[PDB]
Design a protein around this ligand. Structure first.
Ligand SMILES: CCCCCCCCCCCCCCCCCC(=O)OC[C@H](COP(=O)([O-])OC[C@H](O)COP(=O)([O-])OC[C@H](COC(=O)CCCCCCCCCCCCCCCCC)OC(=O)CCCCCCCCCCCCCCCCC)OC(=O)CCCCCCCCCCCCCCCCC
Ligand SMILES: CCCCCCCCCCCCCCCCCC(=O)OC[C@H](COP(=O)([O-])OCC[N+](C)(C)C)OC(=O)CCCCCCCCCCCCCCCCC
Ligand SMILES: CCCCCCCCCCCCCCCCCC(=O)OC[C@H](COP(=O)([O-])OCC[N+](C)(C)C)OC(=O)CCCCCCCCCCCCCCCCC
Ligand SMILES: CCCCCCCCCCCCCCCCCC(=O)OC[C@H](COP(=O)(O)OCCN)OC(=O)CCCCCCCCCCCCCCCCC
Ligand SMILES: CCCCCCCCCCCCCCCCCC(=O)OC[C@H](COP(=O)(O)OCCN)OC(=O)CCCCCCCCCCCCCCCCC
Ligand SMILES: CCCCCCCCCCCCCCCCCC(=O)OC[C@H](COP(=O)(O)OCCN)OC(=O)CCCCCCCCCCCCCCCCC
Ligand SMILES: CCCCCCCCCCCCCCCCCC(=O)OC[C@H](COP(=O)(O)OCCN)OC(=O)CCCCCCCCCCCCCCCCC
Ligand SMILES: CCCCCCCCCCCCCCCCCC(=O)OC[C@H](COP(=O)(O)OCCN)OC(=O)CCCCCCCCCCCCCCCCC
Lengths: 606, 128, 459, 155, 37, 177
């Protein structure tokens, strides 16, 4: 007990220590990024001990260490939940973040604000571990809004760029739309269950859990960029490449998925919520993998890749497999962070070139980036016995052999083929063929920071699915009896995607020029959703914000009915009273009329 | 042949597809040259102040001041109560108030009836 | 309460007998000492209020308002000493005398045991505020602003006076401690309907209620900086304090008299927040955000649950600190570019990075980032209004979208993008300015460590 | 700044329209005010309702982030048509066709999720069998009561 | 047709002044002159 | 349409801008360099067919249906250079482009850290303030009555004069500050 809880809190306090160092400073640091990276590698090592002694005995606890506030019957404490989800997610996040920061010591080396960048990246990591280690909804909401704000500040890192500020505010907007559902869930649990703690929520176990689960699904739709609230995650590629690698691929954007994994005792007893999550995840994983088939910016392709993988995670929550969804989070972190780091290696070697039509011939010119990009694309598409095999193949086998929305299953399989198609789109245009980049070749990947940071996620992308899937305890019963066409569905669908997109890629070399279809323009212009909804919904708001609300009501009509008409009335009465002609005759005639009205008409003499 | 571009409010017509872009008439040349003259005069008036070494402050733009004065202070002197402003001021001013009044009133009447009839599940509700 | 009233009055000979170079230093020093002294009001009990005398008492509602009031005076002096540097010395002392007099009226507004003495201090606050706005405001419109601020108040408050005197004739007392035990139920009638309106509409004007709010984007905009600080931070909260005291006497008629006003607030916070999306004047945007935040306090007081009163007093303290800081930040840009147009001076993070960090923290507290007391008050009001009716979360949640949208837009317009080329008088941030921002923001963030002192009498 | 350079009432005579066109630094043939319907625009020009994104980005703008010169009459909704906000730029696909394709895709997908919900897939198996009266005590059944015996047999 | 001779002459003179300005951004070998630590 | 010197685009300028836009969009459609090179020669052959067209109404008609041709055949996501407007690195470094006048607000302890730089800055400031009145009186003796027609500025005409309105062109920030 005393080892577990101490090293648990030492990991988090250790992460807070470089924030205290950078806020209490006077000098120019002797490599503050190296200090933050050393701190996070040490927090990874320190977090591995409670993880190992969870793997040994299943040892879980709750550290409710500081009573913060008692609102009459709601005692709010600083409470940390050290269960399976925290025990696996904290080392994976720390390992990925340690690779992201050794990558950032190379990629952000020219940045004059590199200490502020490492400060913001560590503040993200602190808010994310506050999110995943939380036991009550208030502390989870602290972590939730904290990763939203660090997402804002890191998307708009180059703040003089208008597109960076627009993408950062768009990410805020969609996440606050999801926070509506988060606060709906908190309101429902407080009013109906008198708690924000997970233990009393799970122990009371309400049957009428439609409305709080709809709130949690809306919160995950915002945070994990599911369909309807999806385009902020491809817009979030406006930030620097380590931001996209850490936050917007592997760690932040699974949080909504993580939220629904955290409330699995409620979702497992609600078939309606499961069907909503299933249809929403299948819609997301179809639509975003379809959008990725025609993109040309490499970070947009990897962003639609990870939003399709989040849709797959939402699917496997929707088939009542939350531990496979969490396994796919912990698996997806390695190869997707590595795919963004390989893309950033290509982008830096080609002088901030991000379009895949100005790449090519990088198989031999960037051999280590090529090796790791091929290993990551095979881990993404579910090559057998790489890390993506140990989660995604089980997800497809469980989605096949279950009482399932059949259209959601079929769209999940079409999305699985589309993953192979856009992965070989990356490999074909970036690595194969002949060069299309400019003539002054500055291709160099010989930094130890770049090589070692991609190397550790490469060892992760080879072996981490095997190691994690053989260390985690069984929490469900795995379906292992199924017909041969249904066992072999994922591999055959992935191979068909590779074959079909080899045909698509070899047709690009032919000397034929076809006009683009409407299917190409639908995939390329993102299903027309950021074109319509980001023009129409701001327009109708902002006109309503100025014409109706500002001008018509609170400059005109609320000004007209109380003060202006009163003022004009008193002015008019003032001018009628003071328009007397100064004639004694008329005043005494009014006095006579006064006396006659008082006597005959008012009877003031009786 | 080709699908004709249909311009919308939020997707305007391109410059290269506009038929008035190819007007070579002398009155359009005079209008374009007069707009260039106004823009060049405003440009010179700006950058004689912008490049002044003795100037330290804000080059005031009367167009910006004129915009911010039109957006706030000129609105009520140019308001006339007529059919349009009254029917828009009452639709968007008291319309939503009536709407949300009946929504919240119907919801709370239904909920109060369920509570006093013992039907609303209020089992663990002690925070309010 | 007289251990606070007498030093506040002794600030008057302190400012009028000071040497001419010492009148900001001495008043700042001794007002900070009074503010340090104000923490003795935290002798609060779980059952009884801290009842000093026949005239004065202090429960956990009035105590944070008193501490915030006594804290705001040194910050107002720091905010105002720069733009009054060229002022005549006697007019400078008269300005400081109006601030001291306003503090004196506020501290016995909040501690007034008896309700007609509350009324007299409540209305006595008008005169220094009117004088500060119309005499030391910068523009022409201050005069018109001084009329609106004067006449929306009195037209609401003169029916309150009559109503209070009626209670004096009916109950025999206006002691709030006596009225806690002698309160009779107020049944449904027309007489009690206009009794309810006379008790409530002065505080509805002070909050402000949406539709009655029109005095505020003139009074807070045309005021000088100390005027705007005390108007947004304290004088709006006279309405919320007065409602929380006066709704004791208005039960059970409130349960249907609140329905229009709740609608006016629930839709009004949708309107005024939306108005903040299209404001060209930055100080007007901060003013309309104050109307939007006080709409929640109106809803929370009208639904009158424990969670709603706790959220409303937390939101009043939090909004006081946040709105006062936002007006001071907007003033720090106004004292460089001499225009309140928000689109004028852009890209200021490239020029003023630490002040941009203050803009960031004030924007984050404006959008109620957890665990700030802004979010504590916001969230507790949202919990209580969800219990009132589950549909309100729509109008609540949509508000929290728009509140984020105008908070960061303000942050994106002024701090981010490219700097304006022709503006070259952007001086580096003075120590006074960063000090003013930190004296707003550091107590605001430290209250998240121990928020129970700002949760009011039914914590 | 002074009074005859501020915005005023709606121009009625042509010389008033000419002097207010001169005030906003633009041609009389280009100056069109908002129509005098009492909404509160006054003499302020109705500029062509385009976003600032549509401006030429390679031009030497006085305000390059805003794409706006000094002294140029600002649009009434300039704060709305900044590049952080509403874009009105021409799109490669027509607006109505974009709306048709997006609505048809979303409606077809929702219809097919409803169809697949009505006709779900499953496996040719019976229900999962649990011992001890379908785990009666484990599911929270009270031990003072006794359920009906749920008996499962070999096959 | 390319530039006019006034445009060529103005760009040449602005080019010479700009390259003088950019040359004047280089540091001296003693710069930055730091205080003694 | 909107140009600093010219009031309009000529027909020849419109044809050349269409030709460049069409080649860039054809390169976006035609990713590979040999395939682009083939179709770019075919597009150049289509532009050379109507090159010697003397009827300007016929040439304007051909230009107009060629713009309709381009609008049908454009790429939805054309290639944009990274620092070009709409690019992924466009206006990225504007947050680092601090204007030079901020150096006037430095403290003397941090101006003493760069003695030769600020000693060399002061002679630029001296040159600018002795050039200002000569270049103002150059502009007002050369601008016609009614104001300038175009936005073009004159060069320096004497030996010793600087070009009028030169300071923010010369002392502009670097693209990589
Ligand atoms: C009672 C004892 C208490 C002791 C502990 C203290 C408790 C908190 C008190 C308040 C602390 C604020 C002080 C720093 C911020 C303001 C000044 C500033 O910006 O300086 C920059 C400067 C360093 O920057 P620089 O490089 O030199 O220049 C800045 C650049 O220009 C550019 O700047 P920049 O943008 O790069 O950097 C700004 C950056 C920008 O970063 C952000 O804005 C992101 C923040 C939000 C997302 C991440 C956090 C999310 C929430 C999680 C944290 C809370 C819960 C954690 C618990 C677990 C989960 C429940 O902010 C930070 O990094 C600040 C870290 C702390 C942030 C706190 C939350 C603020 C967000 C808004 C409200 C949220 C709710 C309230 C939370 C209250 C918690 C107590 O800092 C200093 O020099 C610090 C000076 C000394 C500060 C003393 C603080 C205490 C004062 C109280 C005195 C009385 C009691 C005695 C205690 C003394 C302790 C030493
Ligand atoms: C480097 C500095 C560290 C300390 C150096 C010097 C000491 C050396 C080491 C010895 C340790 C010191 C002695 C032990 C510590 C004190 C123990 C103790 O009983 O302390 C009393 C208490 C413990 O709690 P408690 O329950 O006894 O009392 C709380 C008070 N009441 C009951 C009124 C509510 O306080 C603390 O320990 C305070 C520190 C808390 C640490 C975490 C702070 C997080 C701040 C977040 C703010 C916002 C939260 C919002 C969300 C909350 C959740 C929903
Ligand atoms: C800011 C602008 C809006 C401000 C609104 C202010 C409140 C609106 C309502 C005010 C009503 C008048 C004061 C009521 C005091 C109640 C005291 C009381 O005992 O009432 C019960 C008493 C009942 O009489 P009684 O108590 O003597 O009788 C004994 C009891 N019974 C009835 C059982 C026999 O009510 C009245 O006598 C009349 C109440 C209504 C008065 C109508 C005239 C005034 C109309 C409203 C004017 C509002 C301001 C106008 C100016 C606007 C701006 C320029
Ligand atoms: C994993 C198992 C891989 C082996 C089984 C599938 C082999 C297969 O069907 O390969 C087809 C094809 C290669 O053949 P093809 O491209 O059609 O012809 C060119 C001649 N080399 O295409 C391929 O071999 C490419 C697909 C490989 C997919 C690997 C990841 C799954
Ligand atoms: C009603 C109506 O049509 O009023 C029009 C009338 C002026 O009529 P006109 O068009 O000038 O002939 O205008 C009038 O009679 C004056 C305005 C009529 C009353 C309007 C009341 C509601 C206004 C909005 C309130 C929002 C709060
Ligand atoms: C909610 C409350 C609604 C009522 C608020 C009070 C009225 C509006 C606010 C005060 C007046 C505002 C104002 O400035 O009105 C100006 C107008 C003309 O006054 P003038 O001398 O031209 O102005 C100075 C030079 N520009 O002034 C006038 O036309 C005269 C205004 C007289 C106001 C008296 C209010 C008495 C209320 C009780 C009536 C019975
Ligand atoms: C514009 C700026 C923004 C707004 C600022 C604030 C202005 C509004 C302030 C007043 C709000 C409306 C009045 C309060 C409504 C409370 C409930 C109510 O009275 O319902 C309407 C009433 C229902 O009748 P009933 O409930 O039977 O009443 C008999 C009681 N023995 O219905 C009726 O009896 C019919 C109506 C009778 C006339 C009432 C007139 C006096 C009240 C309004 C003043
Ligand atoms: C489980 C359930 C799942 C349900 C899923 C479906 C539900 C949601 C349906 C869609 C609603 C949200 C989408 C519409 C708003 C999106 C706004 C946005 O992102 O605008 C981006 C726009 C510019 O972005 P862009 O053009 O892409 O940038 C390229 C570089 N210039 O930037 C701008 O124009 C800036 C504009 C700032 C002001 C925006 C005003 C609009 C605010 C809308 C709030 C809506 C609240 C809804 C509340 C619902 C409550 C339940």
């Amino acid at each position: 007990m005393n080892l577990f809880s101490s090293l648990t809190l030492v990991t988090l306090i250790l992460l807070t220590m470089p924030i205290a160092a950078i806020n209490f400073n006077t000098h120019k640091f002797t490599n503050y990024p190296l200090y933050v990276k050393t701190t996070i590698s040490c927090a990874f090592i320190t977090s591995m001990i409670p993880t190992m002694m969870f793997i040994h005995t299943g040892q879980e606890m709750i550290i409710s260490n500081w009573h913060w506030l008692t609102i009459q019957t709601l005692k709010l404490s600083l409470s940390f939940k050290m269960d399976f989800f925290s025990m696996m997610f904290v080392p994976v996040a720390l390992f990925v973040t340690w690779s992201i920061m050794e990558f950032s010591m190379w990629y952000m080396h020219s940045d004059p604000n590199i200490n502020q960048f490492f400060k913001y990246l560590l503040l993200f990591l602190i808010t994310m571990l506050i999110l995943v280690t939380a036991n009550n909804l208030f502390q989870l909401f602290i972590g939730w809004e904290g990763v939203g704000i660090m997402s804002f500040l890191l998307i708009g890192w180059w703040y003089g760029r208008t597109d960076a500020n627009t993408a950062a505010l768009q990410a805020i907007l969609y996440n606050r739309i999801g926070d509506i559902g988060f606060i709906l869930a908190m309101a429902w649990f407080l009013i109906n269950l008198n708690t924000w703690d997970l233990q009393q929520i799970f122990m009371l176990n309400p049957n009428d859990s439609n409305l709080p689960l709809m709130g949690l699904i809306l919160a995950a739709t915002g945070k994990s960029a599911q369909f309807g609230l999806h385009p902020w995650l491809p817009s979030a590629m406006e930030g620097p490449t380590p931001v996209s690698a850490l936050l917007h691929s592997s760690t932040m954007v699974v949080a909504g998925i993580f939220l629904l994994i955290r409330f699995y005792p409620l979702t497992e007893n609600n078939k309606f919520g499961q069907s909503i999550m299933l249809c929403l995840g299948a819609m997301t994983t179809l639509f975003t993998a379809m959008c990725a088939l025609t993109q040309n910016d490499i970070k947009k392709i990897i962003a639609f890749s990870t939003s399709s993988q989040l849709g797959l995670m939402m699917v496997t929550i929707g088939i009542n497999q939350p531990h496979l969804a969490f396994l796919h989070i912990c698996t997806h972190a390695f190869f997707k962070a590595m795919l963004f780091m390989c893309s950033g290696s290509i982008i830096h070697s080609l002088n901030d070139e991000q379009d895949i039509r100005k790449m090519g011939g990088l198989f031999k010119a960037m051999p280590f980036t090529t090796t790791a990009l091929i290993i990551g694309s095979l881990a993404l598409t579910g090559m057998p016995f790489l890390t993506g095999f140990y989660s995604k193949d089980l997800i497809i086998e469980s989605a096949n052999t279950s009482y399932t929305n059949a259209w959601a299953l079929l769209m999940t399989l079409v999305a699985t083929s589309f993953t192979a198609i856009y992965s070989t789109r990356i490999i074909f245009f970036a690595l194969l063929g002949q060069p299309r980049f400019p003539t002054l070749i500055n291709i160099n990947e010989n930094n130890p920071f770049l090589i070692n940071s991609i190397k550790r996620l490469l060892i992760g992308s080879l072996f981490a699915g095997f190691i994690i899937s053989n260390n985690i305890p069984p929490m469900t019963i795995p379906q292992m009896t199924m017909p041969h066409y249904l066992k072999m569905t994922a591999l055959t669908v992935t191979i068909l995607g590779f074959i079909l997109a080899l045909e698509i890629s070899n047709t690009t070399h032919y000397l034929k020029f076809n006009y683009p279809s409407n299917t190409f323009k639908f995939s390329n212009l993102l299903g027309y959703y950021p074109t319509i909804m980001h023009r129409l919904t701001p327009y109708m708001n902002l006109t309503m914000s100025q014409k109706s609300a500002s001008s018509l009501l609170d400059l005109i009509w609320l000004e007209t009915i109380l003060p202006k008409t009163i003022s004009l009335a008193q002015m008019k009465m003032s001018t009628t009273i003071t328009s007397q002609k100064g004639l004694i005759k008329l005043y005494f005639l009014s006095f006579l009329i006064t006396i006659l009205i008082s006597t005959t008409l008012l009877n003031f003499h009786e | 042949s080709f699908p004709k571009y249909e311009p919308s409010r939020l997707a305007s017509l391109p410059t290269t597809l506009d038929p008035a872009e190819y007007d070579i008439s002398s009155e359009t040349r005079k209008a374009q040259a007069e707009r260039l003259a106004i823009r060049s005069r405003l440009k010179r008036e700006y950058q004689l102040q912008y490049n002044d070494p003795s100037r330290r402050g804000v080059v005031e733009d009367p167009a910006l001041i004129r915009w911010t004065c039109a957006r706030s202070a000129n609105v009520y002197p140019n308001f006339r109560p007529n059919t349009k402003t009254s029917l828009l001021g009452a639709l968007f001013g008291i319309g939503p108030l009536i709407f949300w009044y009946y929504v919240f009133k119907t919801d709370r009447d239904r909920k109060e009836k369920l509570i006093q009839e013992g039907k609303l599940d209020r089992t663990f509700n002690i925070s309010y | 309460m007289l251990k606070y009233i007498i030093p506040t009055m002794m600030l008057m000979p302190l400012t009028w007998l000071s040497k001419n170079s010492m009148i900001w230093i001495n008043t700042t020093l001794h007002s900070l000492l009074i503010s340090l002294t104000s923490l003795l009001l935290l002798n609060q009990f779980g059952d009884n209020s801290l009842n000093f005398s026949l005239t004065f008492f202090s429960d956990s509602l009035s105590t944070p308002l008193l501490i915030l009031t006594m804290w705001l005076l040194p910050l107002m002096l720091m905010a105002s000493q720069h733009h009054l540097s060229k002022e005549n010395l006697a007019r400078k002392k008269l300005f400081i005398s109006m601030l001291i007099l306003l503090q004196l009226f506020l501290i016995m507004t909040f501690t007034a045991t008896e309700l007609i003495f509350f009324y007299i201090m409540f209305e006595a606050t008008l005169v220094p505020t009117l004088i500060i706005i119309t005499r030391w405001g910068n523009q022409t419109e201050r005069l018109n602003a001084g009329l609106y601020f004067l006449f929306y108040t009195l037209a609401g408050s003169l029916p309150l006076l009559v109503a209070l005197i009626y209670i004096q004739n009916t109950m025999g007392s206006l002691n709030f401690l006596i009225l806690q035990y002698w309160v009779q139920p107020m049944p449904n009638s027309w007489s009690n309907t206009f009794m309810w309106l006379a008790c409530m509409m002065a505080f509805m004007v002070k909050m402000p209620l949406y539709g009655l709010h029109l005095w505020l984007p003139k009074a807070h905009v045309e005021a000088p900086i100390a005027g705007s600080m005390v108007l947004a931070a304290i004088l709006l909260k006279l309405g919320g304090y007065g409602m929380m005291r006066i709704t004791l006497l208005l039960n059970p008629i409130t349960d249907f008299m609140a329905y229009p006003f709740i609608m006016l607030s629930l839709w009004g916070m949708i309107m005024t927040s939306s108005i903040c999306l299209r404001q060209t004047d930055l100080k007007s945007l901060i003013a309309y955000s104050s109307v939007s935040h006080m709409a929640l306090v109106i809803v929370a007081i009208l639904i009158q649950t424990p969670w709603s009163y706790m959220g409303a007093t937390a939101l009043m303290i939090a909004h006081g600190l946040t709105s006062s800081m936002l007006f001071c930040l907007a003033n720090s840009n106004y004292e460089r570019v001499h225009s309140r147009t928000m689109i004028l001076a852009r890209g200021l993070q490239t020029l003023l990075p630490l002040m941009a960090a203050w803009w960031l923290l004030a924007s984050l507290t404006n959008l109620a980032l957890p665990p700030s007391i802004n979010l504590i008050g916001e969230l507790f009001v949202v919990m209580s209004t969800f219990s009132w009716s589950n549909i309100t979360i729509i109008l609540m949640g949509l508000n929290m979208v728009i509140t984020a949208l105008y908070s960061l837009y303000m942050l994106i317009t002024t701090q981010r993008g490219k700097h304006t080329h022709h503006i070259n008088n952007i001086l580096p941030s003075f120590t006074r300015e960063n000090a003013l921002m930190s004296l707003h923001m550091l107590p605001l963030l430290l209250l998240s460590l121990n928020p129970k002192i700002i949760l009011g009498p039914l914590y | 700044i002074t009074k005859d350079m501020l915005p005023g009432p709606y121009p009625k005579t042509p010389e008033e329209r000419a002097a207010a066109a001169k005030k906003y630094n633009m041609r009389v043939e280009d100056y069109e005010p908002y129509p005098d319907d009492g909404m509160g625009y006054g003499d302020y020009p109705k500029l062509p309702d385009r976003s600032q994104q549509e401006r030429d980005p390679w031009y030497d703008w006085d305000h390059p982030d805003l794409r706006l010169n000094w002294g140029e009459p600002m649009h009434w909704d300039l704060d709305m048509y900044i590049r952080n906000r509403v874009d009105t730029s021409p799109t490669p696909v027509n607006w109505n066709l974009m709306c048709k394709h997006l609505f048809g895709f979303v409606a077809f997908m929702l219809f097919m999720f409803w169809v697949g919900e009505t006709y779900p897939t499953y496996q040719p198996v019976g229900p999962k069998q649990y011992p001890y009266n379908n785990l009666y005590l484990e599911r929270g059944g009270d031990p003072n009561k006794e359920p009906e015996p749920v008996v499962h047999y070999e096959i | 047709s390319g530039y006019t001779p006034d445009e060529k002459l103005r760009l040449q003179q602005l080019r010479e002044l700009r390259r003088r300005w950019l040359k004047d951004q280089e540091l001296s070998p003693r710069e930055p002159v730091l205080p003694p630590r | 349409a909107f140009l600093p010197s010219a009031a309009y685009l000529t027909h020849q300028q419109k044809v050349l801008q269409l030709y460049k836009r069409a080649l860039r969009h054809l390169e976006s459609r035609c990713v590979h360099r040999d395939k682009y090179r083939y179709f770019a020669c075919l597009l150049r052959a289509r532009f050379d067919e109507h090159k010697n067209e003397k009827d300007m109404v016929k040439a304007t008609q051909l230009l107009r249906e060629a713009e309709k041709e381009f609008w049908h055949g454009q790429h939805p996501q054309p290639y944009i250079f990274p620092e070009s407007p709409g690019g992924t690195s466009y206006e990225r470094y504007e947050c680092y482009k601090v204007p030079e006048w901020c150096l006037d607000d430095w403290h003397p302890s941090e101006k003493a850290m760069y003695p030769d730089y600020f000693a060399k800055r002061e002679q630029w400031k001296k040159l600018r303030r002795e050039s200002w009145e000569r270049e103002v009186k150059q502009l007002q003796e050369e601008t016609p009555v009614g104001g300038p027609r175009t936005e073009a500025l004159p060069p320096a005409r004497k030996q010793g004069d600087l070009p009028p309105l030169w300071w923010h062109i010369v002392t502009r920030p670097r693209e990589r500050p």
